[PDB]
Amino acid sequence: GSHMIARIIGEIGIEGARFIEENIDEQFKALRYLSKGIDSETFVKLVIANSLVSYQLTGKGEQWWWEFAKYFYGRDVKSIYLAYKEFLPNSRFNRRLIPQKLSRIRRVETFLSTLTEERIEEYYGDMSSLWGSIARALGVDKESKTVVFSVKMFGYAARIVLSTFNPYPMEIPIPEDSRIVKLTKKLTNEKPRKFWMKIARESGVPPLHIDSILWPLLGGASIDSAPPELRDKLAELIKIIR
DNA sequence: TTTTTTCT
DNA sequence: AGAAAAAAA
């Protein structure tokens, strides 16, 4: 139930989520690779743009993020929109809805240009303000899947370029889509948004850090590299969710 | 239609 | 408010 899941997630903690993010999560590995082949500001802008087109993919998320990172390493990027106009039509893992996705990037381009290194620092210290600002730039609801996901991925990119860690805010929920709906139905009859926010509050682990724990473990990523005590807690969570 | 969105 | 968006079933 909710109490048991919250207890195990609380034992894992932000510390354990941070371990998974930085050591196991393949999307973080892809971002780390790209961060070594392009300037810090362009890197963060590209990560947000990529997140906003990361819906209805033609591939797994891990394949898509690696395709993104390998494509942009060493490239000279000026317009984010023009870069994506060339990138998406040749991609393997993001072939659906390309004109629509390019239009999202053209629309967010101005906001992305405000992401100087200092503004990135400011937003990493106040990710709820970034959450609302991305939504306003697109003219959409901030609860939408790709807006929430862009904040999560911004948090990965910012921590790399700023070499410091700030936890995600408790108020930002897990992104909602057919995938978390299905996982929640495996576990409980409670509605997903209510369920996971309750889990986050009870455990003390913000929802976006819970998001980091869930998907690698559910996808079968190995936990063997976790130190023995954390490994035991991750094994216990696997018993609950998989 | 199924796999998130725009916009009329 | 929900049809259509592109690709894939």
Residue numbers in the entry: -2 to 239
Lines quoted from the article behind this entry:
8-Oxoguanine (GO) is a major purine oxidation product in DNA. The major way to remove GO is the base excision repair pathway, usually initiated by a GO-DNA glycosylase. While no enzymes with an A/G specific-DNA glycosylase or a dGOTPase activity have been discovered in these species, a GO-DNA glycosylase called AGOG (for Archaeal GO-DNA Glycosylase) has been initially identified in the hyperthermophilic archaeon Pyrobaculum aerophilum. Despite very low sequence identity, AGOG is structurally similar to eukaryotic and prokaryotic OGG1 and OGG2 GO-DNA glycosylases and, like these two proteins, belongs to the Endo III structural superfamily partly defined by the central helix-hairpin-helix (HhH) element followed by a glycine/proline-rich region and an aspartate (GPD).
To shed light on the opposite base selectivity at the atomic level, we also solved the 3D structures of the trapped Pab-AGOG-dsDNA harbouring either a T (Pab-AGOG_dsDNA-T) or an A (Pab-AGOG_dsDNA-A) opposite AP site. Concerning the structure with an A opposite the damage, the mode of interaction is less straightforward and clearly independent from the R93 interactions. Pab-AGOG appears to have no difficulty accommodating the steric hindrance of adenine in an intrahelical anti-conformation, but significant differences from the two structures described above for both protein and DNA conformation at the lesion site are observed. Indeed, the opposite A forms a Watson–Crick base pair with T3 of the lesion-containing strand leading to the repositioning of the Q53 and R93 sidechains. This binding-induced structural readjustment results in the loss of the interaction network linking the opposite base to the damaged strand that was observed in the structures with C or T opposite the damage. R93 is no longer able to establish contacts with the base opposite the lesion, nor with Q53, and its sidechain reorients to interact with A7* and A8* of the opposite strand, leaving space for the adenine opposite the lesion. In this structure, one should note that T1 and T2 base pair with A8* and A7* instead of A9* and A8*, respectively, as was the case for structures with C or A opposite the damage. This structural remodelling of the lesion recognition complex could be associated with the significant loss of affinity of Pab-AGOG for the AP site opposite A observed above. Overall, these structural models with C, T or A opposite the damage do not offer a simple explanation why the GO-DNA glycosylase activity of Pab-AGOG is less sensitive to the nature of the base opposite the damage. They do, however, indicate a high plasticity of the Pab-AGOG DNA binding site, which can accommodate a purine opposite the damage in an intrahelical conformation.
